RNA sequence: GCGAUGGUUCAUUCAAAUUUCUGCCCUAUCAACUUUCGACGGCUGGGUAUUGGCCAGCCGUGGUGACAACGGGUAAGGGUUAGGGCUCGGAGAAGGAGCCUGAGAAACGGCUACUACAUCCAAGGAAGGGCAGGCGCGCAAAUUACCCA
RNA sequence: AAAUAAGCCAUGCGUCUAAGUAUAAGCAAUUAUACAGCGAAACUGCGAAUGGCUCAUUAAAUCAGUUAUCGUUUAUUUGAUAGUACCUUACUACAUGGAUAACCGUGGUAAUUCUAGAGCUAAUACAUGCUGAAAAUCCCGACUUCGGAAGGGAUGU
């Protein structure tokens, strides 16, 4: 929700840290709903790029906010140009190192999931649902965008993506 | 400088004659919208603090907020500004207005009491004035009376009784015709709109299917000629 | 005073003419927009038929087409390199049509390593002309502007590749 | 607000209707190829007397033009518009005569139900669909795929669909609606291309007068097949 | 100068030439089919469309950057003399480099959109004749 | 009104709030349709309609001090503000986006500007006395008052004669272009046009004095500042080879010392007789400095510095210590000061033209007295 | 040759009597010509 | 379910803008004219609703003319065919300069500044720029008519 | 039914339909009370590219015939017209907002809406606008009893 995101960002700025201090103007324009796509290419590929000294300070806040903007259904159009290009324009500009925290906020309960053990199939895991069938669809669309925007650089993140995609696939194959 | 003092929270207002400019010296060099204490004005104003909201100097010129000159200035006023109304659309007119600064040359000072004191001004703080009209749209009636989903605004609307002519007949009630009230006429209008949409899409479907079969028939007859 | 009529100029036979008529609103020509590099400053002009054209005066980003591979991405604009018409637009960095300007390369590089996977500028279908590879190792490509920035409100265009790329490199060397 | 003499010579006005003449409002048919409804009601038919009487006829739903109620007084009705009046129970049709003027034709519902309209152009509209534009500015979506330019169409006028079509043909009788040989019902016997603008046809009447009229000014009416009743 | 191009044809692919016929019973010359010049006011290379009037005539001055002037002669009827008189006019036309140019030849031109203050025509057919200089006369 | 620095405060009394403001159409839509709670007291403007909605180019206050002429970008125009009546006197449109104007008379009754489509436009309050095309492009504009003659620099090399480079000068009593004062710029390609090439060939800044001797100082792109003398019509000096393109040129109050500056961001205070610099300062970042003028707090002397990295630093001359520094939050293209004291008017890239107030360099000017009381109220707020 | 590029020295008619020459020079003309000699060369 | 209002695109109508060949009255006490606001191109862009030297950068050498250009004089018809009749046919709103609306104006309807008249006032201030009529000697001659039927 | 002036002098001078917004403290009423009929004021939409006046003129540039727009804009007219859901808010959301005018009051000035301050209230005015639901809607169609369809791809302008 855009109002709750704005009030939450105001509280994050009430936390007064010098890593967030030079980026506040760039932060609030992402929640201003008319200047999101321009502010994305102001943030990345700009003269005011994120400095790698306090990159460790801004990136969790920024990625929770960009995640919320990628979720929100209100201002987006229909079709692909509505919100599919928005998810693609976030993930195409994100770094592969920040993408780990991006998928960390992406996968809530399926972050620490294990599909395969020393034995074959974990039927104890598979005979249980942690997510709604409504909610897995946006997860799979997001991971499709992540993989199609990453390419080879998935190699440091092999251990969880395949567990997620395999869990949703075999839950569907049980539900046929 | 006579003080046109308004209490907006009670909705009352009163003009007060003030002589002895030594009493009015603390109003000097204060911009519009500034908070001044009314304590050095009079003993009946103990605890009052008020904002200054405008005024008219000598020769009756208005005082627009945001002009740093103390004297009378000659602004160019656009459409949606104060101190000027357009005679026609698109008109920018040069008008003289008094600057924001309260000087000695004023005639009336518009004041607004924001915080009272323990004493009541007898004609100002004592009289209550209700609002002229009640709310018209249903959700503002809902937020006013804090209704739930069931309590059906149409009996919770405000009312007013008037006595008409005809040598003193019965009282008569008046009620403001709620705008955002979902009536079955409104719902049937919505249903007729989406029914027009589905009728148009099925007519496009049938005409497209019949064009498909007729076009296949015509190219079959053309290849039968060939 | 700026107009589009032909009543002030001499004829085909070499004769001037009086032909005095007042300037009319269909001979109307407005003042030029030297679109420069900055943050987005666009003013909307209403025109005949009530139709809006977007006079962009300061622009930052536009999308550029690496279309031999099948992508176009929104990238920023660094500074104009050369202009075929004027030198003052090169001096004061004015974005017009058919301007060769250098742009950023990061989304094109990202899409290359995302689709093919072989990294670039740091099997056989992923293949890059080595001049364009030098542009990627610089991290700043040589694009050309195909959209009118003044009469559309955006500075978009395609990237230079092959013969045009080599031609404008030789013209930069000129 | 044109004068009575500057009004065209084919919707007639006598020495009676004042020095001025009504102009037709903008609509389907052209300006100079037009009969307004007030000239049809009170200057041709004389079912009315005055402008206010014509307004009192028009404003109540008593005059229907091409099967729809036409309210405004100077509505253009140029060519072959069936005009249904229900209180009198008549349907008039507009054709021409041999001299070049408007002619009215009384008819009932069976010939009043359809309209013979000449195709102006065929194109591919939005949605990838072929559409058809007649001289009444009627656009028909999804037509029959042989109905090309200068073909005429029997429009249903209760749904508006295509029912039949007559092809442009050397040997099909036609009606002239323009030019110096205006209004001469005869048979198309020859057609010359003249590519580069303004091609012609050579046309003869029933009784051997050859003349050349332009393919814009022609209008196909039927081979023999008088699908509208030309007045006997 | 900028690199001349046919405006919408993708040359730099790693996986042609656009020439339209003018029509009107004309044939495209081989230089207009394959010859590697690029000109946008050419009716076979550029997007210029020929419509309307179709004229002929004899060239005065071939020596100009792709623009020839035609002296068109005609016989005007003066009623005071009740006689025919010679009247010469000068047209201008943009020249494609597809054809082989001569002086004094009889050239066919065609009407297009205004390409300059004078230039409203393009060459379409050249008839190579041994026509002479300004002393030569023929209504044509 | 804001205050940017800690020790010596400046005051952004009027100015754009955001580096990327929205479209004014969308701003008015959200204002008239949404609910907003603005700072009604401290946020204001001081002169009416002191903006252009695109950008701005130059600000000059007259020697009478009653008129502020300012040229800006969309529907390229110049506003004339009467500063006693705190409003627009008028605004007149032009043919293209203006480069640089000067007032000729003590009032606004005569103006001249060098203008982007190679013109010089002379303006009266009646209208516009007609324009003169300069033959080649121009960079700045200066005025010989004692022998009334406009002199503009030019970029590129001349057509015939010598291949030095040129400064176009026309008298106003005589009316014609006299002769281009010939300044060497360097070598250029023999194969080019007559407007030059993209790399070099530019004279940038022309500076003169109007109360002292008035040596016509020019400055060109190969690090060269030149000196010409009036009544000689010929060269006097060529000096100051630097690495950067010379963009600053301004005399002091005495009539001896020069303050020049280069396109990398290095300023040199020279003497007119000593080749070695009196002062050097390498500041800011690599964006080129634009404008430097000397300004006297009533006892001392100090100097401006304005650079397009949004840095305007007021330096000291007697010690060289950085007195104060302002970040205008946007690109700024021109600086001027009110000749009394205190107020720096800056033409920017943004929508609103912004002006700074130094209480510690001077007082509020004679037309906006209450600015000192507003600074006083902000001092109460802190 | 073309539009403005050659300095056509023509006396301009409305540009003829704009401004009067106002000599504002605080130095006394005898010290100034001695100054321009004693620059970096001398 | 029937309409009213509104909406994207394509029509159509009503227009408007350019644009092709021919046709003006006389005159050589008008033979050179254009390049003197570019004069003829072509390339590139800008601006226009669009083409276009219309405008800006680069270069090429032109363009018209004794078959009557150019300059000068000011005295500024077409269609409908017995006939006559009938029909159609630039600049300004006190003076320059700049701006605003709208599908359509460079409205002159408004604004701003300068210039020039002129009105009210409590002397601080504030609003405004036409035609028609009579006299035009002291002696003269057609209604200040009624209605949109 | 024909009926020079230059200068003086007075007088004369929008827009409402059943079909946008009515709590006029406006009129007129009763047999089921948000509104219902008439409806001034005001907000909203339309209108004024002319009716016609004056006077230095326009010498194939206008204008006429004759073309073209494959080089352009078009309110109004009339005709067709829009397949565009889901896509991590769910431990959710499901009668959408705020402004003002008219109005009510307190005034300033010599100076008419020249207007200031204070309190309201509507929209077809300006403005946002995931949702009942495990479906929707397009192209393919194997198998076929006309059966009507297993399941495959896909998501405007």
Curated annotation (Swiss-Prot), chain F:
The keyword rRNA processing applies. WD repeats lie at residues 198-238, 241-280, 287-325, 327-366. One of its GO terms (cellular component) is nucleolus. One of its GO terms (biological process) is maturation of SSU-rRNA from tricistronic rRNA transcript (SSU-rRNA, 5.8S rRNA, LSU-rRNA). Keywords: Nucleus, Repeat, Ribosome biogenesis, rRNA processing, WD repeat. May be involved in rRNA-processing and ribosome biosynthesis. Component of the 90S pre-ribosomes. This is Ribosome biogenesis protein ENP2. It comes from Chaetomium thermophilum (strain DSM 1495 / CBS 144.50 / IMI 039719) (Thermochaetoides thermophila). The gene is ENP2. The chain holds residues 2 to 383 of 668 of the full protein.
